[PDB]
Amino acid sequence: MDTKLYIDGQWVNSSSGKTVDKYSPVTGQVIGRFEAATRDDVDRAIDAAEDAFWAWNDLGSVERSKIIYRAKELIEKNRAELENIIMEENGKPVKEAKEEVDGVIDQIQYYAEWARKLNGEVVEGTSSHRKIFQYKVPYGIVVALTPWNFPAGMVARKLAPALLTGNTVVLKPSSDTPGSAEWIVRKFVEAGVPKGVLNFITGRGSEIGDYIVEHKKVNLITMTGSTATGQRIMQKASANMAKLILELGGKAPFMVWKDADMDNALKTLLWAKYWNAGQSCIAAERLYVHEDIYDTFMSRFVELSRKLALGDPKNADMGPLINKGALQATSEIVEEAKESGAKILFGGSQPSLSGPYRNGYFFLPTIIGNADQKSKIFQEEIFAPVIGARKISSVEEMYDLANDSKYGLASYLFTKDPNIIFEASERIRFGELYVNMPGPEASQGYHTGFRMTGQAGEGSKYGISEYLKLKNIYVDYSGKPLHINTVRDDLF
Amino acid sequence: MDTKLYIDGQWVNSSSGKTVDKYSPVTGQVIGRFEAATRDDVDRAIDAAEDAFWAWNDLGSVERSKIIYRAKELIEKNRAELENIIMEENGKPVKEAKEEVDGVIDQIQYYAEWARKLNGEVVEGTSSHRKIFQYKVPYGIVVALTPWNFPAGMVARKLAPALLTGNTVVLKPSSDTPGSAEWIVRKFVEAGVPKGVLNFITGRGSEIGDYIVEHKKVNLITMTGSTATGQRIMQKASANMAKLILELGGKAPFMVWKDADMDNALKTLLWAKYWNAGQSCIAAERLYVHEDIYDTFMSRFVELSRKLALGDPKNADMGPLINKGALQATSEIVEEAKESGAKILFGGSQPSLSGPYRNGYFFLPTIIGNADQKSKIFQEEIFAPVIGARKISSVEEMYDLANDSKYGLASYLFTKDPNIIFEASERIRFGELYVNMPGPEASQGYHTGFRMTGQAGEGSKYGISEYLKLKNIYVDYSGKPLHINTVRDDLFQS
Amino acid sequence: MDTKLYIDGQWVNSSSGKTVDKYSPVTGQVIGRFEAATRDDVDRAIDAAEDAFWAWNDLGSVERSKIIYRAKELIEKNRAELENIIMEENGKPVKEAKEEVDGVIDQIQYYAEWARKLNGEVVEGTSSHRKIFQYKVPYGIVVALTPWNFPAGMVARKLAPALLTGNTVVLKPSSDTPGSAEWIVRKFVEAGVPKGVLNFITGRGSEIGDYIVEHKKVNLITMTGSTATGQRIMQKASANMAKLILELGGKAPFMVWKDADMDNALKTLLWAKYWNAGQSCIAAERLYVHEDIYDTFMSRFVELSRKLALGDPKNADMGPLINKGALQATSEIVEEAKESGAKILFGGSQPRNGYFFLPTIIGDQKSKIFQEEIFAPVIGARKISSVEEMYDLANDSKYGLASYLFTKDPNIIFEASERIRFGELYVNMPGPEASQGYHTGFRMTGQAGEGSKYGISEYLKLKNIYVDYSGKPLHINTVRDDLF
Amino acid sequence: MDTKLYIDGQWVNSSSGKTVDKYSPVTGQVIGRFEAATRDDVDRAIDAAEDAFWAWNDLGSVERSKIIYRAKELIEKNRAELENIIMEENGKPVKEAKEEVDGVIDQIQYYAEWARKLNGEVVEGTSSHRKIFQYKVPYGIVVALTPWNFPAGMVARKLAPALLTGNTVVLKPSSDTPGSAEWIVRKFVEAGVPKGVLNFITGRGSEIGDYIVEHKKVNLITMTGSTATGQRIMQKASANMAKLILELGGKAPFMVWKDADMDNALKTLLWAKYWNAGQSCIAAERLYVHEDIYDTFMSRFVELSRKLALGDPKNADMGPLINKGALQATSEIVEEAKESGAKILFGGSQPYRNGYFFLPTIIGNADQKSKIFQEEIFAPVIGARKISSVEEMYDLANDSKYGLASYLFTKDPNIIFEASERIRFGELYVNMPGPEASQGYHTGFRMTGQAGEGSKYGISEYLKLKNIYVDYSGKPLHINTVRDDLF
């Protein structure tokens, strides 16, 4: 797929004509290309979103929802095409690609269903002949910045609420996964999104990234990705005071109390660690097992991890890392751990793979013992199929080790003690706590976190409302002379 | 008077022993001092807030509300002392000082009434034996940065909801107005706020402001003031991803359609321009009057403006600017307007007063004709008793002119046409529209705005909810083996 | 059309074998029949609803909504048939049949869209290790009782939110309009609503009505119709304490201030009086026109009323009344009005065997024309000269549902929003109500309301779970620690 | 204490002059009179309420809240007077009386705090130049009918939210406890409630009951009491369609799974059965204990019940039944039980001797279908049964016409979360006692009543939502059934 830009109702090339090649993480083969958009291209996209705003707002949420549901229908009817794009660009195992596309469909539906239901308020004024009307209206122009790890799902998650609520949009996907975004945009276009309401820009984040986020006409930035990019966005958005929705991943503690159902905890850990090869904002990143069951738990964890097949999406349990850079950084992480004295219980390198897969970015499930609570393995995001384990003995210690993190997104807890479950619901200072089940998050949840997770959140009533600004209209209908306490009446 | 620090439940001096002078805006003479907190004083204060956090959270909102109500009653009983401090520090007219204290009392009541009413949610899970519990919990440590213009109102606005919701607090007030903040803090102390829950740090923002805002342990910053300081706080808080509540002032258009009630519009404009000498986040900053009535309107407005007395708070209608630098900045603005061809219809200089007032920072009501929509007088916040006026002749034009601003907080409209009122409610892209009435904003309102106004808002259910974080707990209580679509069940079979 | 009963997943006859005729109000002749259900059949319907509850509940709102959405799609695909049923059973003008079916489709969509958004709550407990969880759950078994006037719209109105929220349902439509209701149930069944969840019972309300509403397993009654039947239901429903949702119509004041846009007020009034021949819960029932414009207003209104065509659904602007009794009742109202010295400006008589009545305009505040619901193409008009007088005449009524105000004065508009004590106030526009609105009223209007977040929430019950997770000994003020 | 009527801002006697005596449940002696109001007095009270309405509504919630907070303050200053009235009228033990007075204070506080926070809504209209405004407004005239069992608490519970929300009120307390209601009424008047806003009427249910609930000008009826009275109220309020808030008591199952903490379950059971002599809308009325611990549990339950002291409010653990009719009704309950094959494990009769006291009574081996397990007791009598499965426990619990409170003791988190749906009761107390909190929505299933009280949702039962649809296009309207060419 050679992708193009979509600006002011047309598919076009970059004004510079420059492009960037895309490689399969499965095989290493070059498989596509995208347009490297210029700054003038960004301006034209943002101005098109400005010019389309008032007519799009004025349509009302019901007419907007019809277009969004038509998009969903077109996506569902042609879903195989999107599943194949994900498998090609990301190397996801087939069931992960199908689930992701199921999630695009579920999310678009969920958000469109908010039509005419996100009410404003009427409150008492300062007299019987005054009222305060509180309208909820759109922010205006939304810049959507999507990551590579859930390249279809994150696009649906941001576009759907933004459009429903009456914002116009400029979308820029990750440079590793332009194809899934393009395909979704084209579906909204086919469904009848009007000229300029939805724009699509690809390019080097290092050439246009700051420029998009600091532009004077941008009202809201919705973004998922790395901590360092998020920090940079918040710095640059000081220029326009844009509203920020930022999700920057985490370092989820996976906590197994002594009374855990072992099979359910292990099932959930295979999912939390190895789903999408650990390239998940909610991946298990630190494992804490009660000392009474640590040895059995770890023996089983290692035995199951060894049975995971890596390779082609048609048949594998786990896919590859996204690019050569992720593979290099994962190798460095493993070597730093070994250099600090950690002990590798399984994995710690690339697999030995046959045919075309020998050239993809595969990395083995990797399980570490003997790493300190204070170590990089336990304090810095890995985003790869690597995890360290440690023993725990008390509930208070469990909460502290968990909360001892600059991150604050997801967490997992396995236990049958009700007092721990109800107490952890406040003491575990993470945005999502999964008790005796796996993620992922549901659309009806508010996906957010504490500390370095980011700003605001997504999903639920509160998530979609993040795309609406509340404004106040103070009316006096007494029809009588005003009396103002500090304005002498003696003047009138 | 001399202010001190309140750190971990003690009144203390700065650890360097250094202090900074406070000037009277009425006389221009030194009238007090405050401690210059160090980086190490800030650390102890934030550390005390961290250590008090769990036990303050764990009291619950009802018990926290009882302490906050007590503070309210103590403030009320001794209100006169606060009224005096505001008149002394700010030079506010007596009725403005009393109104501000009224507001402190109303706000603290209103926020405390939210006790056990800010509910979380329970939502359907992905099977019948799954639920998603959404709890609302404090962020943790709140840093509150208050401005000089409503130096008692702004403290109440930030401390009441932060505390009610279970956050611990480090307050740093404006260097122009330490006294009113200290006095409020002391009332909270006397009402029984536990040690560490509330800390009070004074010192120049240029010196410790960056340090406070970027600190690894800060979870939320609530701030009101200038646009530049807001932009800086946002840049620095990129280090900790603090939740930001920032209110950065505005450039409120004042719109008077041809069918307006003249008396009401004029009364409201006197209020909107001259209340607090125009040093208000919602001040009338641009005047748009329909061409049919512009000449009568401007004549009446000039005539009323001349009648306002300046000087002592005991009897003035309008007070001084806060400091020498605000006075200089106001003169520059007027001069840049005059050098640009603008017609001064009234004022445009300091008055001539005798006695101590001669050294105070007074400036006359100043009314300007024929500056462009695109001039600095129409595009840059003034925050002083100065306004330009321009004609209008269509509703569409009125909306476009109003929205032609990097600002977006308050706005004012006088008209009897219902179609303009309901339509402007959407087409005027400002956080507050006052229709046939003055401000100020009410506690039940959500004080906020568009564009450069800032982040989030204050007041209403939604304002107090800015100090709570929503967190989810996904529970599976089927008691049955899990089935996960991407995990093969043959890995768990014999 | 011959209709049957749908009980626990089967289309069946009445166990007595008896049936009841349905007449056309266009031609006056018999055009269909429906089953007269017995007590036995009621009990089987309700027991099947009870038997289906837990599995319906446990499916969750998303899976229930998928079925409801498929229902909407099948209805939409076959909409011509339902439009034809309404024109055949009610005689509605073609444009009104098409409207009603648009609103069936709109309503089912809107209610289905509430899936997984009607949250419960979590509040603080009385200590730090105590919480109070507030779940919203179905009431259980819902009895739905529908009127003849919007015989398809009213079915969609009640089935959609009841089903989305996880209640099971026994529906009994009006004996004037069984066909439209059956056709909708059939579509829900075709969509895959499981056995027992939805049941359909026909039978004269005068014969099995009290038995249904009094039944010991019924947890919620949702009904629209006449005031007398609503009152009766609320008496009978004291047996089970069913939660009631009753919409009983009204006596809408239509107020035209001196500054009104005359054209918009006249266009609107033509809609409000003569839409569905006045057989509407929000019909204009009393006309108040400022003395300054009263004459011109009435002259023009009469001129426009006389231009309405009556007869066949294909050609007419206004259909017949529903049946012979309503024709007789409308005559009785007009005759009584004349016997009280009412001045007829136009009409006041029938215009072959159908139940057509002419638009009728009368030219006294306390008379039966002004204090009793007419539900026919008849209205009286009265002069007003102040705002306060206007509010008090409006509010001088045992009814409290809809109302209409034409004015350009913002002070009247904002003030009337509190002073006009009616559930609905239409300012410078016609009805009907929107689904995002909460259709309700004051005084004799009924109980609860329909539409909006609040309306759909009427079908959900709030329950509390108080949990203590201290894991410590309890200390109870009035229980002595020394006992332990 | 002799009480009077408060009608249109004046204290007055019945227009007939007739009065009714009130008896101590501690001694059986006459201790007060109250006025027997006529149908004409009631019309005067309601007309007063009607005449006071617009001025009360137009004050707004903040100003109303101030009057309500002042009433709370005057109540808290003089709280001993109320505590004593509750001990004299009801005979509660001193700490129950103190408890009830704290709850009066807490509830008045809680409801008044809802000032300017119960917002309406703005929703999108059918075009960009339409909106629908949804105002929350008072119903108007509220008739409050309070029971005798919590005779101060229930008055606070009804008056505070009805008044905060801007309704005017006619209060009619139970003929068994007029004193506490009158005292509270006087404090609201002292605090500044204006003329006609709050009226107070006493008299016989058999003279004025129907008449008060069916009156044409009544908008809302809020009532707590017996199933029978609620049913009658619902019949009679068909004449006016009054919005109803009825709480009609219960038959709370109390369920102890095998893994329960025994001490805490027993403590809570002591509270749930004996608090206010079991004359509680949330009282333990049926006991189900896991077969593994049934014997030890019933054993300790009898040993502990034997020790509860009956008698004088200063020193007793449990006071008397409210009047002689409740006394004879309780005996007839315990006798019907023994005549049907039930075993008395403790108590069964009366234990100052002229008063209406009745001992803790624990009945064994009675059928789940028996009068004891199916009909409200409202007295310190309780029947027990074994259980052995979770599904059984739910089915036994839900096998009742009632649906208010229920109690559960267990450490298995799957029963706790599953019971939260499967126990079809408005209130489920898990490893703790009642009573309900002001933030909870006190309500139930089946014959419990209508609507509910407490929480945001409860105060909102006193507001009616109205809609205003506005078109501000300024342009010609187009209506699908009407011709443009006609103009």
Same domain, B309 and B219: no
Does the residue A489 lie in any domain?
Answer: no
Same domain, B284 and B385: yes
| Collapsed DSSP state (helix, strand, coil) of residue C98 | helix
Same domain, A107 and A228: yes
Dihedral pair phi/psi, residue C231, rounded to 5°? -60, -50
How far apart, in whole angstroms, are the C-alpha atoms of residue C156 and residue C110? 11
Same domain, B307 and B382: yes
Instruction: Dig out the tokens for A377 from the structure.
Output: 């393995």
Same domain, D213 and D255: no
Please spell the DSSP secondary structure of D85-104, one letter per residue. HHHHHT---HHHHHHHHHHH
**Which residue of D134, D140, D482 is in closest CB contact with C270?**
D482
Which residues does residue D22 pair with via DSSP β-bridges, in sequence order?
Answer: D32
Does the residue A437 lie in any domain?
Answer: yes
Listed by number, the residues of chain A in 166-195 with a beta carbon closer than 8 Å to a beta carbon of chain D are none
CATH code at position B23: 3.40.605.10
- CA pseudo-torsion sign D105, D110, D111, D116: positive
**Would you call B444 an interface residue with chain D, using a CB distance cutoff of 8 Å?**
yes
Does the residue D485 lie in any domain?
Answer: no
State the catalytic residue, choosing from C89, C182, C281, C433. Answer: C281
Instruction: Dig out the tokens for A357 from the structure.
Output: 């897969």
A20 vs A30, A171, C100, C255, D32, CA distance in Å?
A: 11, 18, 56, 68, 95
Residue type, A339: E
How far apart, in whole angstroms, are the C-alpha atoms of residue C223 and residue C244? 8
Domains in chain D: how many in total? 2
The three-point CA angle A10-A15-A20 to 5° equals 95
Same domain, B7 and B143: yes
Instruction: Dig out the tokens for C109 from the structure.
Output: 């969509």
What proportions of chain D, in percent to the nearest 5, are helix, strand and coil? 40, 20, 40
- Count CB neighbours of D32 within 10 A: 19
Among D394, D421, D437, give the residue marking a domain's end. Answer: D437
What distance in Å separates residue A444's CA from the closest CA in chain C?
7
Does the residue B1 lie in any domain?
Answer: yes
**Which residue of D241, D263, D477 is in closest CB contact with C267?**
D477
What proportions of chain B, in percent to the nearest 5, are helix, strand and coil? 40, 20, 35
Q: What is the chain D residue with the closest CA to C427?
A: D470
Query: What's the Rg (C-alpha) of chain D?
Result: 25
CB contact under 8 A, D133 and A121: no
Picking from B103, D63, B120, the residue whose alpha carbon sits closest to that of residue A486 is: B103
Cβ neighbourhood burial of C70 (10 Å; 0-12, 13-18, 19+): middle
CB contact under 8 A, C234 and D234: yes
What distance in Å separates residue C182's CA from the closest CA in chain D?
27
Does the residue C210 lie in any domain?
Answer: yes
What distance in Å separates residue C214's CA from the closest CA in chain B?
32
Same domain, B259 and B401: yes
CB contact under 8 A, B448 and A470: yes
Peptide linkage before A440 cis (omega within 30 of 0): yes
**Would you call A69 an interface residue with chain C, using a CB distance cutoff of 8 Å?**
no
Please spell the DSSP secondary structure of A16-65, one letter per residue. T--EEEEE-TTT--EEEEEE---HHHHHHHHHHHHHHHHHHHHHHHHHHH
Cα C71 to chain centroid distance, Å, stands at: 21
Sequence-distant (6+) residues with CB within 8 A of A424 are A399, A413, A433, A435, B473
A292-301 own/partner pairs: CB under 8 Å, 24+ apart: A292/A258, A293/A256, A293/A258, A293/A260, A293/A262, A294/A389, A294/A391, A296/A262, A297/A256, A297/A262, A297/A265, A297/A266, A298/A345, A298/A367, A298/A369, A298/A389, A300/A262, A300/A266, A301/A266, A301/A269, A301/A367, A301/A389
- First-to-last CA distance in chain C? 75
Picking from A22, A126, A112, the residue whose alpha carbon sits closest to that of residue A72 is: A112
Same domain, D165 and D175: yes
How far apart, in whole angstroms, are the C-alpha atoms of residue C278 and residue C274? 5
Listed by number, the residues of chain B in 323-382 with a beta carbon closer than 8 Å to a beta carbon of chain A are none
- CA pseudo-torsion sign D191, D197, D199, D205: negative
**Which residue of C60, C134, C409 is in closest CB contact with B128?**
C60
Query: CB of B403 within 8 A of CB of B426?
Result: no
**Which residue of B418, B444, B478 is in closest CB contact with D472?**
B418
DSSP label at residue D208: I
D14 vs A330, B476, D3, D18, D189, CA distance in Å?
A: 90, 63, 11, 6, 20
- Residue ranges of alpha helices (H) inside D149-248 are 153-164, 178-190, 210-214, 227-236
Instruction: Dig out the tokens for A213 from the structure.
Output: 């986020």
State the catalytic residue, choosing from B247, B441, B458, B466. Answer: B247
**Would you call D61 an interface residue with chain A, using a CB distance cutoff of 8 Å?**
yes
Strand order in the sheet with D168-172: D10-12, D5-7, D198-200, D168-172, D141-145, D220-224, D243-247, D449-450
Cα D279 to chain centroid distance, Å, stands at: 12
Does the residue C474 lie in any domain?
Answer: no
Using a CB-CB distance cutoff of 8 angstroms, which residues of chain B are in contact with residue C127? 60
C395 Rama class: left (phi>0) / alpha (psi -120 to 50) / beta: alpha
Test mutation, C65, C106, C117, chain A, max A CBs within 10 A: C117
Picking from B419, A364, B255, B26, the residue whose alpha carbon sits closest to that of residue C409 is: B419
B137 vs A97, A402, A428, B134, B140, CA distance in Å?
A: 36, 18, 11, 10, 9
B347 vs B287, B308, B353, CA distance in Å?
A: 16, 12, 15
Cα A327 to chain centroid distance, Å, stands at: 21
**Angle formed by the axes of helices B262-274 and B294-306, nearest 10°:** 50
Residue D420 in marked binding region: no
How far apart, in whole angstroms, are the C-alpha atoms of residue A389 and residue D481? 73
Picking from B235, B252, B231, B217, the residue whose alpha carbon sits closest to that of residue B402 is: B252
Residue C205 in marked binding region: yes
- Count CB neighbours of A362 within 10 A: 24
Same domain, A323 and A433: yes
CB contact under 8 A, A122 and D122: yes
Instruction: Dig out the tokens for C233 from the structure.
Output: 């239901």
CB contact under 8 A, A116 and D123: yes
Query: CB of A138 within 8 A of CB of A88?
Result: no
Q: Which strand (E) or helix (H) includes residue C252?
A: strand C252-256
Using a CB-CB distance cutoff of 8 angstroms, which residues of chain D are in contact with residue B423? 129, 472
CB contact under 8 A, D59 and A121: no
How far apart, in whole angstroms, are the C-alpha atoms of residue C444 and residue C281? 12
Which chains sit next to A, with 3 or more Cβ pairs under 8 A? B, C, D
Picking from D371, D285, D357, D290, the residue whose alpha carbon sits closest to that of residue D320 is: D357
CATH code at position C298: 3.40.309.10
How far apart, in whole angstroms, are the C-alpha atoms of residue D253 and residue D372? 12
Instruction: Dig out the tokens for B461 from the structure.
Output: 């259910």
How far apart, in whole angstroms, are the C-alpha atoms of residue C191 and residue C67? 6
State the catalytic residue, choosing from A35, A182, A247, A432. Answer: A247
Picking from A123, A117, A178, A186, the residue whose alpha carbon sits closest to that of residue A146 is: A178
Q: What is the chain B residue with the closest CA to A459?
A: B472
Same domain, A241 and A265: no
A-B interface: how many C-beta pairs under 8 angstroms? Answer: 242
Which chains sit next to D, with 3 or more Cβ pairs under 8 A? A, B, C
Same domain, D222 and D268: no
Does the residue A484 lie in any domain?
Answer: no
**Would you call C76 an interface residue with chain A, using a CB distance cutoff of 8 Å?**
no
Number of H helices and E strands in chain D, helices first, is 15, 20
- CA pseudo-torsion sign C331, C332, C333, C335: positive
CB contact under 8 A, D122 and A124: no
Test mutation, D117, D420, D441, D475, chain B, max B CBs within 10 A: D117
* Full domain range(s) for residue A402: 250-442
How far apart, in whole angstroms, are the C-alpha atoms of residue B198 and residue B171? 8
Using a CB-CB distance cutoff of 8 angstroms, which residues of chain C are in contact with residue A446? none
**Which residue of A113, A461, A477 is in closest CB contact with C115?**
A113
**Would you call C226 an interface residue with chain D, using a CB distance cutoff of 8 Å?**
no
**Which residue of C437, C461, C466 is in closest CB contact with D467?**
C437
Test mutation, C464, C468, C481, chain D, max D CBs within 10 A: C464
**Which residue of A110, A117, A477 is in closest CB contact with C453?**
A117
Q: Which strand (E) or helix (H) includes residue A424?
A: helix A418-427
Please spell the DSSP secondary structure of D262-289, one letter per residue. HHHHHHHHHHHHHGGGG-STT-EEEEEE
CB contact under 8 A, C123 and D440: yes
How far apart, in whole angstroms, are the C-alpha atoms of residue A473 and residue A139? 17
DSSP label at residue D122: E
Does the residue B494 lie in any domain?
Answer: no
Picking from A270, A278, A282, the residue whose alpha carbon sits closest to that of residue A308 is: A270
CB contact under 8 A, B124 and C61: yes
DSSP label at residue D193: P
Test mutation, A54, A123, A164, A425, chain D, max D CBs within 10 A: A123
Picking from C249, C199, C202, the residue whose alpha carbon sits closest to that of residue C223 is: C249
- First-to-last CA distance in chain B? 82
Query: CB of D342 within 8 A of CB of D372?
Result: yes
How far apart, in whole angstroms, are the C-alpha atoms of residue C136 and residue A72? 30
Picking from D487, D75, B349, B227, the residue whose alpha carbon sits closest to that of residue C300 is: D487
Residue B247 in marked binding region: yes
Dihedral pair phi/psi, residue D164, rounded to 5°? -55, -45
Q: Which strand (E) or helix (H) includes residue B199?
A: strand B198-200
Instruction: Dig out the tokens for B163 from the structure.
Output: 């505390």
Q: What is the chain A residue with the closest CA to C413?
A: A477
Q: Characterize the bridge pairing of strands C130-138 and C120-124.
A: antiparallel
Using a CB-CB distance cutoff of 8 angstroms, which residues of chain A are in contact with residue D119? 121-123, 134
Q: After which residues is chain C broken (C to N over 2.5 A)?
A: 351, 363
Query: CB of A92 within 8 A of CB of A100?
Result: yes
CB contact under 8 A, D420 and C480: no
Residue A232 in marked binding region: yes
Same domain, D321 and D398: yes
